[PDB]
Structures are given as C-alpha cells and as structure tokens.
Amino acid sequence: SPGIWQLDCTHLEGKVILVAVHVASGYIEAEVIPAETGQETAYFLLKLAGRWPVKTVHTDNGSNFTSTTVKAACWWAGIKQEDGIPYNPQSQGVIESMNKELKKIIGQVRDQAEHLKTAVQMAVFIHNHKRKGYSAGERIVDIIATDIQ
Amino acid sequence: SPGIWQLDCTHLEGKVILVAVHVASGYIEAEVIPAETGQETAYFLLKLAGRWPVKTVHTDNGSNFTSTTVKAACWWAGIKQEDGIPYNPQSQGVIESMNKELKKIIGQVRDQAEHLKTAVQMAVFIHNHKRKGYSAGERIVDIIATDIQ
Ligand SMILES: O=C1C(=O)N(Cc2ccc3c(c2C(=O)O)OCCO3)c2ccc(Br)cc21
Ligand SMILES: O=C1C(=O)N(Cc2ccc3c(c2C(=O)O)OCCO3)c2ccc(Br)cc21
Ligand SMILES: O=C1C(=O)N(Cc2ccc3c(c2C(=O)O)OCCO3)c2ccc(Br)cc21
Ligand SMILES: O=C1C(=O)N(Cc2ccc3c(c2C(=O)O)OCCO3)c2ccc(Br)cc21
C-alpha cells in the first residue's frame, strides 16, 4: 500500500485537471492539461514516479489503461499498471468527494491568480498541508519512511 | 536543514532547465522552461512547496531574489527566500558537478524521447533512484520523517 496511487481526471473551465492520489495518505499531485491523452498521462506518470516510489497505479479509465504510450511509461518507470475499477464501491464516492473538494478549494483561491494552473497548484498546496492531527503530506512521508525501515 | 532547498538553473538545447535540490539529501525536482523569468520561477516554487515541506529556498541568482512575483510566491507558500551565495565555497563546485551529472544522464536517455522535457524527467527519475546504499529519494523521506517525529 505505500506504493499505490490512483489516477483521477476532472474538468473545469473547459480544461482537464489530472490528479494522482496516494491512496493510503490522501496526498495529491495535479496538473492542468488541454485534454486527457495517453501522451499527457504518460508524461504525468513519469514525473510522479521520479518524485515518489510509485509501485502500482490504478488508472482512471480504459483509454489510459489501453494507451501504448501509458504502457511504455509504466514499463520505463517500473510501475504496475492496474485498472481503477471500484471493487470497493466506496471508491466512486471518495473520488467524487475529492473532485468536489478540489474544485471548492480552487474556487476559494481562483481570484488570486490569472491562470487556472496556478490556482490548481495553490489547491494542491492547501490540500496537502491541511490538518485533519496529521496532514496528507505528513502521512505520505511517515508511511513511506516506515516502509523503508 | 530538512526544509532547505537550493534553486539551480542550467542550459541545454537553447532551453533552460530549472532545478530544485533538497540540500541534505541530493533529491531533485526539475522542469524545462523557455527562459528563466520571475513568473516561471514563482510557479516552480509553488509546485515544489505543495509537494514537500519547503521552509527555506536559496535562490539561484539576484534577479529571482529580487523578483516581486518570486517574493509573492514565497510569501504565499510560507517560504523564507534567501540568497544562494556560496559562503561555503564548495557550493559552486557541488552545483557545477550536479549540472554536469544531470546533462550526462540526459545524454544517456536523450534518444529514447523526442522532447527534452521528457528526457529531463527521465533524468530526475534516474538521479533520485540511484543507489549511492541509500538513494536520494530514500534519504529525503527519512530526513523529513525523522523531523516529523
Ligand atoms: O476529500 C478528499 C478525499 O477524500 N481525499 C482523497 C483521500 C483518499 C484516501 C484517503 C484520504 C483521502 C483524503 O481525505 O485526502 O485520507 C486518508 C487516507 O485515505 C482527497 C484528496 C484531495 C482533495 Br482536494 C480532497 C480529498
Ligand atoms: O497569484 C498569482 C499569480 O498571479 N501568479 C503569477 C502570475 C504573474 C503574472 C501573471 C500571471 C501569473 C499567473 O497567474 O501565473 O498570469 C499571467 C498574467 O501575468 C502566481 C504564481 C505563484 C503564486 Br503562489 C501566486 C501567483
Ligand atoms: O552530483 C550531484 C550532486 O552533487 N548532487 C547534489 C547534492 C547536494 C548535496 C548532497 C548530495 C547531493 C547529491 O549527490 O545528490 O548528496 C548527499 C547530500 O548532500 C546532485 C543532484 C542531482 C544530480 Br543529477 C547530480 C548531483
Ligand atoms: O520516450 C518517450 C516518449 O517518446 N514519450 C512520450 C511521447 C510520445 C509521443 C511523442 C512524443 C513523446 C514525448 O517525447 O513526450 O513527443 C512528441 C512526438 O510524439 C515518453 C513519455 C514517457 C516516457 Br517514460 C517515455 C517517453
């Protein structure tokens, strides 16, 4: 479980927000892209796996699951690509709740920046630092550190 | 020291590679940009600080140190912006050595991808996973986890 991530794609202002969630911690990374393509998804996964020890990725849909470019990136980066089918049905709802929360945070900061991408990164910051008392950022580090020992 | 990062800017193929180094671990994040502007640097720091607990950044030059946009981002993200003057003169050399090593890794992967940005992210991956035996990725997590506890 310390190496497990979930991809998630949501839409705002006619653009796409691509999100990777560390399942055990709730920590996220995100980017704005014009549209979800295999190439964009593959590049996003390469960035993620260079930054955190990504063992398994639950892909967000069948097109990315199928994409040869995504498969090439997962091979390159040593990532096991899996489906993201909510076998535990509470998964649909958890992701849905996350997307709603992210968009809410984006709305709270939206006026501080001109570009959506800036507002998205502010929202990533706010989410990962929020005290729930540990934050997601603290949890991911502790989880992986425990795993290393 | 767990919160201390150093910015570094290097050039390749007529483009700019912006690098943030976690001083205590040697862990890096990097991006390709057309040119090093305050706005690009500010955005890069926002991304970094949303992902890792950035307390202090040693800026790479006086223009970024002075930039109002960089100062605004450091304020927003709770980052103490400092100079990057090598008071310990081995700093010039360590950064120089890093840039040389990065470019070498980029050269080793360059043919596998068309875009420089992809090759840079492959090099980030290879650097952060390389066993020196701990890797930089392992060191940064351990350092921050120890700090949390
Ligand atoms: O509300 C949520 C949520 O459920 N998560 C996802 C999540 C998944 C699994 C978890 C989570 C979270 C989380 O609450 O961040 O927390 C404990 C560990 O298990 C979010 C992530 C980003 C943003 Br913005 C909002 C949320
Ligand atoms: O609020 C802004 C902002 O406007 N940007 C920078 C910026 C400066 C000038 C611009 C900008 C932006 C931007 O929103 O990226 O958009 C194009 C118009 O001119 C930020 C970067 C980091 C952080 Br934290 C906050 C912000
Ligand atoms: O050769 C180096 C180097 O010195 N570092 C920077 C660095 C700074 C301080 C350290 C470092 C490193 C490092 O070797 O990564 O290692 C142990 C902790 O103290 C590099 C970072 C990325 C890449 Br690519 C190459 C290098
Ligand atoms: O080697 C490539 C590659 O070509 N890309 C993706 C890619 C696919 C098709 C392209 C690409 C790229 C790319 O280099 O980003 O460049 C534009 C021409 O058509 C990679 C993405 C992740 C990883 Br890991 C490796 C690679």
Oligomer state equals: homodimer
Major β-sheet annotation of chain A: 5 strands, mixed
Counted by DSSP, the helix tally of chain A is 6
Helicity level of chain A, as a percent range? 40-55%
Shape of chain A: globular
Which fold name is given in CATH as the topology of chain A? Nucleotidyltransferase, domain 5
Q: How many beta-strand segments of chain A?
A: 5
Question: What is the terminal-to-terminal distance of chain A?
Answer: 15 Å
- Hetero compounds: ligand CBJ
Number of domains of chain A: 1
Please identify the structural class of chain A as seen in this structure.
alpha/beta
**SSE pattern of chain A, N- to C-terminal:** EEEHEHHEHHH
Supply the CATH architecture of chain A. Answer: 2-Layer Sandwich
By CATH, the superfamily of chain A comes out as Ribonuclease H-like superfamily/Ribonuclease H
Cofactor (chains A, B): Mg(2+)
Protein name (chains A, B): Gag-Pol polyprotein
Organism (chains A, B): Human immunodeficiency virus type 1 (HIV-1)
Subcellular location (chains A, B): Host cell membrane; Host cytoplasm; Host nucleus; Virion
